[PDB]
Amino acid sequence: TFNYVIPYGGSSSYTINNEPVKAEEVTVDFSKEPSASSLKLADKSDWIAYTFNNVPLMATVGLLAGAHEAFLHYERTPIYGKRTYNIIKKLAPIVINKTAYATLLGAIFCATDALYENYSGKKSYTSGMVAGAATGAVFAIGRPLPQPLVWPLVFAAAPVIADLFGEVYPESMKSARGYGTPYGFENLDDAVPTRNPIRRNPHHY
């Protein structure tokens, strides 16, 4: 409007609908659909199955962290001097404990997420928040004062961030095209494509 007399923006009729018009005459899709593996892992029906399918990721991350710390300890120890102690006995707890703690935290998160979703019966943000909060509570069992408040918050926030930018964002902005005519405005006289642009072939790596 760019005036001071009437409200800015506009209004669209709710009664009047515009019949959908295809973006192009022929649509070629270079985006592959989700794999059967993805759907299997995503299935939260059985909490135990869901947990056991998704823990490998947490275990791997714990193993990488433990390997990192163990290597740092091993690198410093001197080869030239003989050591009374056994290095593996010193280093094995590091890796084992890190992997176990990571797996336990990821198990708690996955279990609570599946159990809440089943009990509630709906896929919602709350399920992620309560799983994160429970994981952060387990993380901060014996930590000083600030940490009990901070970790349940950071952990609860992480599934919120994942849901907003991993699931809601793409579905929200699926229609936008970028070529031909703007999604909403097809009356405007813009070049109309016979086929959609294919910027890349479907990936295979």
Binding site: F2, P7, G178
Partner: protein, 438 residues
């Protein structure tokens, strides 16, 4: 319009060719020429053209410039207030930085392209880092604060502009586009949230103002805060009205909370500049809420209140600077007896403080009345909340005035001829707007 833009481009250009001894005189003459060109732009703006008074394009969508009600008022305010900043600053380096900042800000107001708007407003990012972080009187902390807050907000705005340019195909305001996306609305909103200080993103402002030179503080409070209202009216409400209506309870919560917490924080301040900075933060909340109502009464009220603030806050910052030059202190506790020792400084200080409290003969009164009417149009409780909490501003202002007004002082610290010359235009403008020539 073309004359104004040309004068704007000539002012930074003139410095390159000046003698390095005539710099201040040339800069003052250029500032006055830019003011006169702005008056010419006002003369060549016919009210008959209701939508945009004038639009000029120089070969691309980025170079599309135009003036509307908000743009016209803000541009005239910037041109009116720049001469004061110029005279208050000494040195070629300082002049160069100030003139570049002013050119970037004044070009941003008239820009009608979101990407061009971003290019022009954020160009003056290092210059503020360098200005607020000057060798002896500056603070690196304040510079880092303002720079990081600006970069993060403007980057979010840039991402939203890129999506709008990809989806619609253009990002120019003159092309009617509507979006219901909440991510894009949030991206555009975050810039407004930070630039116009709103709790909890207001921390950058007080630090910058305290450690900025008087010319910098005057420019910042006078017009830099207003750049948010141009972005709202020109780049947010036309496209993202649906999201402002969807989030109105949240917008109202954040704006009222900003007004309350800022008012309470002003009570614990012992530095005059911090008091003026927190007063500005409190005042910005009404403008933001009034514009978000998307009503005629609100948009006009917000712009009017912005002009009133852009006339009252530079005055207080100027008087504070004059006092600091005379005394080398900003602590209210050290400053006493100012009534007896500086009757002329005191009179102007009291007048400006009365203006800040929105008394009837000041522009703030009319502006507040209009903004409150817009809130009352939305809901009666909305207006009542804002009206009631206004007493907190009175408590802090009264306490400050009382501490400054009386006591024992052995130093005559009054304004010189130069100091009266610098505030006289601001006083006259305040009086004229107060009597209803808004």
């Amino acid at each position: 319009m073309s004359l104004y833009l040309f004068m704007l481009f000539l002012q930074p250009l003139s410095l390159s060719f000046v003698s390095r001894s005539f710099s201040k005189i040339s800069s003052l003459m250029m500032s006055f020429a830019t003011l006169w060109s702005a008056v010419y732009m006002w003369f060549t703006s016919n009210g008959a053209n209701q939508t945009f008074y004038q639009v000029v394009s120089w070969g691309s969508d980025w170079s599309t410039f135009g003036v509307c009600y908000t743009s016209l008022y803000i541009s005239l305010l910037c041109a009116f207030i720049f001469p004061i900043c110029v005279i208050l600053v000494q040195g070629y380096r300082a002049l160069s930085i100030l003139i570049c900042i002013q050119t970037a800000v004044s070009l941003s107001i008239v820009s009608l392209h979101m990407l061009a708007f971003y290019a022009l407003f954020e160009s003056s990012l290092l210059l503020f880092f360098i200005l607020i972080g000057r060798r002896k009187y500056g603070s690196l902390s304040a510079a880092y604060n303002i720079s990081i807050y600006t970069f993060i907000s403007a980057l979010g705005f840039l991402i939203s502009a890129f999506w709008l340019n990809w989806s619609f195909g253009s990002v120019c305001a003159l092309l009617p586009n509507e979006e219901a996306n909440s991510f894009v609305a949030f991206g555009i909103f975050i810039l407004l949230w930070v630039k116009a200080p709103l709790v909890p993103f207001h921390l950058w402002l007080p630090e910058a103002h305290v450690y900025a030179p008087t010319a910098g503080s005057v420019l910042l409070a006078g017009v830099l805060l207003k750049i948010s209202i141009v972005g709202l009216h020109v780049f947010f409400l036309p496209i993202c009205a649906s999201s402002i209506v969807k989030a109105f309870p949240l917008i109202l919560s954040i704006c009222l909370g900003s007004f309350i917490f800022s008012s309470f924080s002003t009570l614990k301040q012992i530095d005059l500049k911090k008091i003026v900075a927190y007063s500005s933060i409190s005042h910005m909340a009404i403008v933001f809420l009034s514009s978000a109502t998307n009503s005629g009464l609100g948009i006009q009220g917000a712009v009017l209140y912005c002009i009133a603030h852009g006339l009252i806050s530079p005055g207080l910052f100027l008087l504070v600077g004059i006092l600091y030059k005379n005394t080398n202190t900003k602590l209210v506790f050290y400053l006493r007896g100012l009534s007896q020792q500086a009757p002329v400084w005191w009179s102007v200080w009291v007048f400006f403080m009365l203006g800040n409290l929105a008394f009837p003969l000041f522009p703030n009164f009319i502006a507040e009345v209009v903004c409150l009417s817009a809130l009352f149009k939305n809901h009666e409780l909305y207006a009542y909340a804002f009206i009631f909490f206004s007493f907190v501003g009175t408590v802090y202002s009264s306490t400050v005035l009382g501490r400054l007004k009386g006591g024992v002082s052995s130093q005559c610290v009054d304004a010189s001829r130069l100091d009266v010359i610098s505030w006289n235009p601001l006083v006259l403008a305040t009086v004229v707007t107060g009597i209803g020539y808004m």
